[PDB]
Curated annotation (Swiss-Prot):
Keywords: ADP-ribosylation, Cell cycle, Cell division, Cell membrane, Cell projection, Cytoplasm, Cytoskeleton, Disease variant, Ectodermal dysplasia, Glycoprotein, GTP-binding, Host-virus interaction, Hydrolase, Isopeptide bond, Lipoprotein, Magnesium, Membrane, Methylation, Nucleotide-binding, Nucleus, Phosphoprotein, Prenylation, Proto-oncogene, Ubl conjugation. The gene is RHOA. This is Transforming protein RhoA. It is an enzyme of class 3 (hydrolase). GTP binds at residues 11-18, 29-36, 58-62, 116-119, 159-161. (Microbial infection) The basic-rich region is essential for yopT recognition and cleavage.
């Protein structure tokens, strides 16, 4: 009857995974109370005229539990693989940590590469703090290149803070899961 797809979100601690789920889940109508933990959390989305049940799994809190975390991977239909645009170190962990893991436990599962916190790219305090480490915010082309490099289905940027791009992240994930 209903189409259910399992979505798992991964990426470094504090890169915006939980906030991204919260903003998406709060967008749903009728309005529902949204918790701060997501484990098989069912969200109903309509994409291209089709009703889909997305079962959301957040790995926040598990980023350094290398043996516990992969227990969430079986029968995943789509991966949101996140980094934060205010953290080049988070982007470097995409090929170095997250991609090998996800490809191992989720073979042939489509990956959406997601750059979070896009509102920080041109933020004065963010630039100043990063410059102390000889870094700067991630550029869009660096995100697009990484997405090609890891064989992502697509690349999206979003901000949980402004909500820009959030809907589109989940529409893209849903299409990927269906196809
Ligand atoms: N400026 C900005 N801050 C964000 C955004 N998303 C999350 N944050 C903040 O970044 C921190 C980590 O976010 P969280 O979603 O808990 O990250 P998680 O550990 O990956 O689940 C929190 O202080 C959030 O309020 C965003 O889009 N823009
Ligand atoms: Mg990351
Ligand atoms: Mg976010
Ligand atoms: Mg839940």
């Amino acid at each position: 009857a209903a189409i259910r797809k399992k979505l798992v979100i991964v990426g470094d601690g504090a890169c915006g995974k939980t906030c991204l789920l919260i903003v998406f889940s709060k967008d749903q109508f009728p309005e529902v109370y949204v918790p701060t933990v997501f484990e098989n959390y069912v969200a109903d989305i309509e994409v291209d005229g089709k009703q889909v049940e997305l079962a959301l799994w957040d790995t926040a809190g598990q980023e350094d539990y290398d043996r516990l975390r992969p227990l969430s991977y079986p029968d995943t239909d789509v991966i949101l693989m996140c980094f934060s645009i205010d953290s080049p170190d988070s982007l470097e962990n995409i090929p170095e940590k997250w991609t090998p893991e996800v490809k191992h436990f989720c073979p042939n599962v489509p990956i959406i590469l997601v750059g979070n916190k896009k509102d920080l790219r041109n933020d004065e305090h963010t630039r100043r703090e990063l410059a102390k480490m000889k870094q700067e915010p991630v550029k869009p082309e660096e995100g697009r290149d990484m997405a090609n490099r890891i064989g992502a289905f697509g690349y999206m940027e979003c901000s949980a803070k402004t909500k820009d791009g959030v809907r589109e992240v989940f529409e893209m994930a849903t299409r990927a899961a269906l196809q």
